[PDB]
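Build the 3D complex.
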Amino acid sequence: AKLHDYYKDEVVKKLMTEFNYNSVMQVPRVEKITLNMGVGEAIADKKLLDNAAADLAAISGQKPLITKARKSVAGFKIRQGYPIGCKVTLRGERMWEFFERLITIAVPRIRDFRGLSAKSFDGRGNYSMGVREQIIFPEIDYDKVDRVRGLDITITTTAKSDEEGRALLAAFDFPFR
Amino acid sequence: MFTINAEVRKEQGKGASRRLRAANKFPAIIYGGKEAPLAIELDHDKVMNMQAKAEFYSEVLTIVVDGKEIKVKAQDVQRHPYKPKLQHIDFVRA
Amino acid sequence: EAKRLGVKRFGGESVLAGSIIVRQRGTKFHAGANVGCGRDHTLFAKADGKVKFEVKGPKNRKFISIEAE
Amino acid sequence: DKKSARIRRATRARRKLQELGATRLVVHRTPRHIYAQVIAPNGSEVLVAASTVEKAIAEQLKYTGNKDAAAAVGKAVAERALEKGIKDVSFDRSGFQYHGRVQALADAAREAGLQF
RNA sequence: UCCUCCUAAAGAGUAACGGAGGAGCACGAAGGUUGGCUAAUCCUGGUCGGACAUCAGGAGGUUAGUGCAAUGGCAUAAGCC
RNA sequence: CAAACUGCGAAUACCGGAGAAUGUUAUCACGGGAGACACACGGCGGGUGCUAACGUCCGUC
RNA sequence: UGCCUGGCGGCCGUAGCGCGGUGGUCCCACCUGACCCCAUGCCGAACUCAGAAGUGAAACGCCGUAGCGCCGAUGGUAGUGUGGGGUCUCCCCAUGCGAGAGUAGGGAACUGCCAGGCA
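Done.
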C-alpha cells in the first residue's frame, strides 16, 4: 500500500505518457513475486533445506511451500517425490513491503555490481533471474549464516512483451546494464 | 485454332471402359460451373497425336460435341503406369 | 484358449433387460440410454427394446442406445 | 480460463443426471447478477427461470447481487416450481462451491416446501 | 496350467511338432464416496549446470503415466492430492 | 516398404425389423433306433517354407 | 419483434488455427481488506463477502481475410462375388458392387428455449 500508492501516482502516469496508452489499465500490473531456492544440494543433507526455508519465512511474511522432484534422470541420480527446494509466492502487502525493502538498500550494496540485464527475458516480459551471495539481504545476519547460498528471483506481470518490462525497468530507474 | 473431334457417351462403368480400350478408345469428362458434368468418349490415336504437341499445357481446348463449341482446359490427366496409353482425361469449363 | 470377442447384438435388434450387447476387451463403445457398463467393460441392456448405433463426441466416439418398442 | 473450468467441472454431474432422465434445477452465480432456471429432462427446455437483473424480482432487493437477493431468488424459484408442478426436480449447482449464496438459495428452496 | 500378438482370408469361431512371450502375483491400501489438480519433449535465465538435480515463463495435448510380459482402452480420466 | 502400422478406405460375409414369391413345413423341439469317430482329389483366400514351387496345414465348396 | 449480450442442447475440424477491426446500451471480465460464508500442500492459488472508482484491456462475443487447415462430388483407377479361357507365379472375357487420393464445389457455419438491453 505504502509503495503501491506512489507507484500508481508516478509510475503509471510516466508509463502512460511515454507509451501514449488509451486504456486506463493498459499500464503493466504486477501479479506476484516468486522467491525460489534451486540449490540442488538437498540430496546430500536435508537440514540445509529446512534452515533455508526458515530463513526465507523469516525474511518474508509467509512460509514457503516445499517443491518435489519433477522428472528423474539417471545421470544426476534423482528419484521421484524427494523434496529438493521451496519457493515463496509473494502477493499483496507482503510482496509490496518485501520489494520496497529490497530496492531500498539491498540492490545497491552488492559486490561486483555490473548492473542488471534488460535483455534476458523469458519471452513475454517476465524477469526471472538469479542472485547469489544471500548475505546481501539485511535480514540474513552473520548469526544465522550457514554457507554462501544463492536464490532465484522472479517478478510476474500481466505484460506480454519485453517492451513493457523495459518500461518497468525505466520506472525503477534502471541504474545500469 | 486447334480442331478437336468428340463423340457422345451413352455407356458408363468399368465394363464400358474395358470395351472402349478394346475398341482402341477411352472416355473423358468435363466438369465445372453450375452445369452438370458430362462424359465424352474419344479415340486413341488421334487424341494421342493431339496431345503430342508441347503447347497443350497452356492452351484452351475447343471441344466440338453435338455440333457445339465448348472451351475447356485439362487440369489433370490420367495416364497408364508404364504403357504409352491414355485411359481417362479431365477437363474444366474455363 | 481363444477369448471370445465381438459384437453379440447389432443395431435394430430387440433385446431384453440384462442382455449384453457387445463384450469388448477395452472400451470401443460407450453406454447411452438404458445401457449399463459392467466391471469387465461389457455393455448390458437395462430395458426392453431395439438397439441403435451412433457416433458423437469431440473424438467421434461410438455410443450404444436402446429405444423401447 | 474460469468459465471453461467451471463448465468442465459441472459436466460430471450434468452427464450423470442424463441417465436418470429427470428434470433438474440449476443456478448461475456471479457477483454482478445471479441466474436460475429449472431444466427439463430433455436438456433443451426450461419450465421456469429468473434473473436478478429483472426488477420484477429485484424491486425489494437493495442490489441484484447479495446473499439476501440470492435467498429471495431461490424462494421465488421454489414457489414458482411448486405452483407449476415440477414433480420433485433434482439439484445441480452448476459446478460451484456449496458454501455461499448457492447454499443460501438451496436452503430457501428446501424450506419453501421442497423435498430435494 | 492360465493369459497376450499374427497366422485367422473387413460377422463370430477356425488347425500343424507354426511363427513370439509373461505368471503362480499382490491390498487392511494400491478399494469405495465427495471435493480439486492434470503428461513425456524442447527453448529462454540459472555458484553449483557436464546438454541430461530443481526452479519462473513459453510451446506440447497424451509418443508420458496407467504395478507385472503383452493386448484393448483411460483427459469426463481408469493418472495424482 | 510392413505379420505384434492406419489422418483413409472396397468386394464379400454375418445379425436383426418389414415384405410379394417359391422349396411336398422344405424349420424347430420331444422320446426310441441308429452309423462313423484313420477320408482322398480339384477350385477359391492365406500361413509355414528361401516372396525355390507343383512340399506342408487351414475355412468353404 | 430488427440488432447486441449470457445461459440451457445437438451438430464435433462447413463449428478448428493464424491476422486485422469493433464492444460497454444490457451481460461478462478486471478490485482491495478478509480477522467475518468459504480455505490454502505458503498465497484470497480457485471460490467467496461491496459493486462501479473507472475501463474493455489479459481474456471474452462479433465481422472481414479461403492464408493454414477441413469436408468433399460425377467420372476414372486399383479390387472383388459369379461361369469360362489363356503362354495358369498371373492376366482377360459378360455382369453386379465399387477404392483411396486428386479435381470441381462447399464453407469464416446452422438450429430450439430462456433472460436483459438498444427500438
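Chain B is about 15% helix and 35% strand.
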